[PDB]
């Protein structure tokens, strides 16, 4: 299979519910690429939007490059830089066990990516291990963020005027990691991304969250089943037997006002101090770099 003249579609490397991702070859440049395909069917496809957001993000550390956008037949096409495995894939590879050092190494970078997205007037609204990828080669130590499928402006580009507080929202992201605010149908802001990262971190520590694996025919039902267990579990019980810093983090994030600018530095500082007190070095050796 080919896409136009310049690209070679290889084998599928990811299924997204938005589109599917193929490993590919830029034949004209002699470089491996990732190629996202979306089928056009209505007059509101969303890959055109996602690519316009990627482009506004460019020149960010841990933002993949976009090489080409256009259409062939009834498919929208996005060609981007190829990245390594997801943190979900790496977790599975490491037997669903990460060391505290690996979790803290990741935490520092994952706050910084989210910060950078917020600095560009957007919230992500789909923060999950699947959506963080390690780079390849010289970028093997660099955590990337992908999938701006569900991203939106939280403040005016011009004025920095925050979006107003609104309720009864469409529950559209992944329920395992959704903020308590998202569960009550409250409009998402910067605090919701950072809380979601909190649940991602405790996911890596535990191996699973105590609200996982609950069957539902519907997306609405998935959120509601998880909501009950989540809202009945104190931050302090969730994180018990782990460094206080994981509690302090989730607590800080839940205490933020709708339209508060987070202290991204403080949250980074928390994990750094724990990191140094444990006696770890920032050598960028994750558990999987030790595989012989
Ligand atoms: N540029 C990329 N390079 C490598 N894998 C990717 C890339 N983009 C997406 N993927 C994979 O595709 C999966 C789903 O992509 P998405 O539906 O866009 O979030 C992710 O979990 C990744 O494993």
From Swiss-Prot:
<dbReference type="GO" id="GO:0071539">
    <property type="term" value="P:protein localization to centrosome"/>
</dbReference>
<keyword id="KW-0488">Methylation</keyword>
<keyword id="KW-0472">Membrane</keyword>
<feature type="binding site">
    <location>
        <position position="36"/>
    </location>
    <ligand>
        <name>ATP</name>
    </ligand>
</feature>
<keyword id="KW-0597">Phosphoprotein</keyword>
<keyword id="KW-0333">Golgi apparatus</keyword>
<dbReference type="GO" id="GO:0050321">
    <property type="term" value="F:tau-protein kinase activity"/>
</dbReference>
<keyword id="KW-0808">Transferase</keyword>
<dbReference type="GO" id="GO:0090263">
    <property type="term" value="P:positive regulation of canonical Wnt signaling pathway"/>
</dbReference>
<protein>
    <recommendedName>
        <fullName>Casein kinase I isoform delta</fullName>
        <ecNumber>2.7.11.1</ecNumber>
        <ecNumber>2.7.11.26</ecNumber>
    </recommendedName>
</protein>
<dbReference type="GO" id="GO:2000052">
    <property type="term" value="P:positive regulation of non-canonical Wnt signaling pathway"/>
</dbReference>
<comment type="similarity">
    <text>Belongs to the protein kinase superfamily. CK1 Ser/Thr protein kinase family. Casein kinase I subfamily.</text>
</comment>
<keyword id="KW-1003">Cell membrane</keyword>
<dbReference type="GO" id="GO:0032436">
    <property type="term" value="P:positive regulation of proteasomal ubiquitin-dependent protein catabolic process"/>
</dbReference>
<dbReference type="GO" id="GO:0045296">
    <property type="term" value="F:cadherin binding"/>
</dbReference>
<dbReference type="GO" id="GO:0048471">
    <property type="term" value="C:perinuclear region of cytoplasm"/>
</dbReference>
<dbReference type="GO" id="GO:0034067">
    <property type="term" value="P:protein localization to Golgi apparatus"/>
</dbReference>
<dbReference type="GO" id="GO:1904948">
    <property type="term" value="P:midbrain dopaminergic neuron differentiation"/>
</dbReference>
<dbReference type="GO" id="GO:0061512">
    <property type="term" value="P:protein localization to cilium"/>
</dbReference>
<dbReference type="GO" id="GO:0005524">
    <property type="term" value="F:ATP binding"/>
</dbReference>
<dbReference type="GO" id="GO:0005654">
    <property type="term" value="C:nucleoplasm"/>
</dbReference>
<keyword id="KW-0067">ATP-binding</keyword>
<dbReference type="GO" id="GO:0036064">
    <property type="term" value="C:ciliary basal body"/>
</dbReference>
<keyword id="KW-0539">Nucleus</keyword>
<dbReference type="GO" id="GO:0106310">
    <property type="term" value="F:protein serine kinase activity"/>
</dbReference>
<dbReference type="GO" id="GO:0032922">
    <property type="term" value="P:circadian regulation of gene expression"/>
</dbReference>
<feature type="active site" description="Proton acceptor">
    <location>
        <position position="126"/>
    </location>
</feature>
<comment type="subunit">
    <text>Monomer. Component of the circadian core oscillator, which includes the CRY proteins, CLOCK, or NPAS2, ARTNL/BMAL1 or ARTNL2/BMAL2, CSNK1D and/or CSNK1E, TIMELESS and the PER proteins. Interacts with DNMT1 and MAP1A. Interacts directly with PER1 and PER2 which may lead to their degradation. Interacts with MAPT/TAU. Interacts with SNAPIN. Interacts with DBNDD2. Interacts with AKAP9/AKAP450; this interaction promotes centrosomal subcellular location. Binds to tubulins in mitotic cells upon DNA damage. Interacts with GJA1.</text>
</comment>
<dbReference type="GO" id="GO:0005737">
    <property type="term" value="C:cytoplasm"/>
</dbReference>
<keyword id="KW-0090">Biological rhythms</keyword>
<dbReference type="GO" id="GO:0015629">
    <property type="term" value="C:actin cytoskeleton"/>
</dbReference>
<feature type="domain" description="Protein kinase">
    <location>
        <begin position="7"/>
        <end position="275"/>
    </location>
</feature>
<dbReference type="GO" id="GO:0005886">
    <property type="term" value="C:plasma membrane"/>
</dbReference>
<feature type="binding site">
    <location>
        <begin position="13"/>
        <end position="21"/>
    </location>
    <ligand>
        <name>ATP</name>
    </ligand>
</feature>
<dbReference type="GO" id="GO:0005813">
    <property type="term" value="C:centrosome"/>
</dbReference>
<keyword id="KW-0225">Disease variant</keyword>
<keyword id="KW-0723">Serine/threonine-protein kinase</keyword>
<keyword id="KW-0206">Cytoskeleton</keyword>
<keyword id="KW-0418">Kinase</keyword>
<dbReference type="GO" id="GO:0048208">
    <property type="term" value="P:COPII vesicle coating"/>
</dbReference>
<keyword id="KW-0547">Nucleotide-binding</keyword>
<comment type="function">
    <text>Essential serine/threonine-protein kinase that regulates diverse cellular growth and survival processes including Wnt signaling, DNA repair and circadian rhythms. It can phosphorylate a large number of proteins. Casein kinases are operationally defined by their preferential utilization of acidic proteins such as caseins as substrates. Phosphorylates connexin-43/GJA1, MAP1A, SNAPIN, MAPT/TAU, TOP2A, DCK, HIF1A, EIF6, p53/TP53, DVL2, DVL3, ESR1, AIB1/NCOA3, DNMT1, PKD2, YAP1, PER1 and PER2. Central component of the circadian clock.</text>
</comment>
């Amino acid at each position: 299979l080919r896409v136009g003249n310049r690209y070679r579609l290889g084998r599928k490397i990811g299924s997204g519910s938005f589109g599917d991702i193929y490993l590919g070859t830029d034949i004209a440049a002699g470089e491996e690429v990732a190629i996202k395909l979306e089928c056009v069917k209505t007059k509101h496809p969303q890959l055109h939007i996602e690519s316009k957001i990627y482009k506004m993000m460019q020149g960010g550390v841990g933002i993949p490059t976009i090489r080409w956008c256009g259409a062939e037949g009834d498919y929208n096409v996005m060609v981007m830089e190829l990245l390594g495995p997801s943190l979900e894939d790496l977790f599975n590879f490491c037997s669903r066990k990460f060391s505290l050092k690996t979790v803290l190494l990741l935490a520092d970078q994952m706050i910084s990516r989210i910060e950078y997205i917020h600095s560009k007037n957007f919230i992500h609204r789909d923060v999950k291990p699947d959506n963080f990828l390690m780079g390849l080669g010289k970028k093997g130590n660099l955590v990337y963020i992908i999938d701006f499928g569900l991203a939106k402006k939280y403040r005016d580009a011009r004025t920095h005027q925050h979006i107003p507080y609104r309720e009864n929202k469409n529950l559209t992201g992944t329920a395992r990691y959704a903020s308590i605010n998202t569960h009550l149908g409250i409009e998402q802001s910067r605090r919701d991304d950072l809380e979601s990262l909190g649940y991602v971190l405790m996911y890596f520590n535990l191996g699973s969250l105590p609200w996982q694996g609950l069957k539902a025919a519907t997306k609405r039902q998935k959120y509601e089943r998880i909501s009950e267990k989540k809202m009945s579990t104190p931050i302090e019980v969730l994180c018990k037997g782990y460094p206080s810093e994981f509690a302090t983090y989730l607590n800080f994030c839940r205490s933020l006002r709708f339209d508060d600018k987070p202290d991204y530095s403080y949250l980074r500082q928390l994990f750094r101090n724990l990191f140094h007190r444990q006696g770890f070095s920032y050598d960028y050796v994750f558990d999987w770099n030790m595989l012989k």
